[PDB]
């Protein structure tokens, strides 16, 4: 027992109890992992949420757009897990795109300054995070990031889709670098999940305009999924991420694992 028994995994991206990163952390601990969490901006509020996990764990601040945060990351993580110890896993569950580039706003009306910001946080940070943490990762390690299949365009997602396409490409290169440390790098392309952020997006940025398309688009996942899809349950996704963090997918890297009920393999 204990899928991640005796493993040191840094999990990023927790902002609310609905965050995918929160469920990844939970299942991870339930499987015997010692976690190190990173938060952005409102650390106090994050701490409130994190304290609801199965076990306690170090919470460090990390704004992936801040050079010093990334420059001190390794040292700060080492102080947290104790000198002489290294990380066995890294979870990147960070994403962002201003309303201008994701929602009801026209595709052609997104200022690059906004798009660039979204790509910085959603894609480039996967590499900067890898750079800061690879030096303190043990062989057999695993870096995992969250993705949303951008192989085909769709309503509303717009520039966040572009950001995910960049992410998938960044992951392939991070895998080359990571390989030098005996570490694997992969993405988990999850089906739609009703996280607070997602729920806000779905509605708070479309009203009754795109609300239709997004409703249909959304309903399509469960229809297409041979084993169905429950947008209100992040657990299957969290389990998939822990699977990549374990030693049971030792020959897979620079890849993408789809945790979407099999929806992307079906047309109707
Ligand atoms: N919600 C979905 O249906 C869905 C589907 C597929 C993939 N994903 C991906 O999963 C990840 C998390 O999704 P979520 O719905 O749980 O989102 P939210 O927590 O619920 O997660 C986004 C995280 O981004 C963090 N963040 C934003 N800017 C940051 C910065 N500069 N530095 C550090 N952190 C920053 C936030 O603080 C937050 O914790 C994202 O990469 C997202 O694109 C989500
Ligand atoms: C902070 C943050 C977190 C996660 C995302 C992220 O991955 N998006 C969220 C809304 C999703 C909406 C949906 C589109 C099609 C069908 C069903 C639902 C699309 C993907 C962006 C920003």
Curated annotation (Swiss-Prot):
GO biological process, any: mycolic acid biosynthetic process
Residues with site note (May act as an intermediate that passes the hydride ion from NADH to the substrate): 148
GO CC annotation, single: plasma membrane
Post-translational modification: Is phosphorylated on Thr-265 in vivo. In vitro, can be phosphorylated by multiple Ser/Thr protein kinases (STPK) such as PknA, PknB, PknE, PknH and PknL. Phosphorylation decreases enzymatic activity.
One of the Pfam families matching this protein, by short name: adh_short_C2
EC number: 1.3.1.9
Marked site positions, Transition state stabilizer: 157
Pathway: Lipid metabolism; mycolic acid biosynthesis
Outcome of swapping residue 93 to A: Confers INH and ETH resistance. The mutant is 17 times more resistant to inhibition by the INH-NAD adduct
Modified residue annotations for Phosphothreonine: 265
Binding site for substrate: 157
Keywords assigned: Antibiotic resistance, Fatty acid biosynthesis, Fatty acid metabolism, Lipid biosynthesis, Lipid metabolism, NAD, Oxidoreductase, Phosphoprotein
Binding site for NAD(+): 19-20, 63-64, 94-95, 164, 193
Remaining remarks: Was identified as a high-confidence drug target.
Family of this protein: Belongs to the short-chain dehydrogenases/reductases (SDR) family. FabI subfamily.
PANTHER family found in the cross-reference section: ENOYL-[ACYL-CARRIER-PROTEIN] REDUCTASE (PTHR43159), ENOYL-[ACYL-CARRIER-PROTEIN] REDUCTASE [NADH], CHLOROPLASTIC (PTHR43159:SF2)
Protein name (database record): Enoyl-[acyl-carrier-protein] reductase [NADH]
């Amino acid at each position: 027992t204990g899928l991640l028994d005796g493993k040191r995994i840094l999990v990023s991206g927790i902002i609310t109890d609905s965050s995918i990163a929160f469920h990844i952390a939970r299942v991870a601990q339930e499987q015997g992992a010692q976690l190190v969490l990173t938060g952005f901006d409102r650390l106090r509020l994050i701490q409130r949420i994190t304290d609801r996990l199965p076990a306690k764990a170090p919470l460090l601040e990390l704004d992936v757009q801040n050079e010093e945060h990334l420059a001190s990351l390794a040292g700060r993580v080492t102080e947290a897990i104790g000198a002489g110890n290294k990380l066995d896993g890294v979870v990147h569950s960070i994403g962002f795109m201003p309303q201008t580039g994701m929602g009801i706003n026209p595709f052609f009306d997104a200022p690059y300054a906004d798009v660039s910001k979204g790509i910085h946080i959603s894609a480039y940070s996967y590499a900067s995070m890898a750079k800061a943490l690879l030096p303190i990762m043990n062989p057999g390690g695993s870096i995992v990031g969250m993705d949303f299949d951008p192989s085909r365009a769709m309503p509303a997602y717009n520039w966040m889709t572009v950001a995910k396409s960049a992410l998938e490409s960044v992951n392939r290169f991070v895998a080359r670098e990571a390989g030098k440390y005996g570490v694997r790098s992969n993405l988990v392309a999850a089906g739609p999940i009703r996280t607070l952020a997602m729920s806000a997006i779905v509605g708070g940025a479309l009203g009754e305009e795109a609300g239709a398309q997004i409703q249909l688009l959304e309903e399509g996942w469960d229809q297409r999924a041979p084993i169905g899809w429950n947008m209100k349950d992040a657990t299957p996704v969290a389990k998939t991420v822990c699977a990549l963090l374990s030693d049971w997918l030792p020959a897979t890297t620079g890849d993408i694992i789809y945790a979407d009920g099999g929806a992307h393999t079906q047309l109707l």
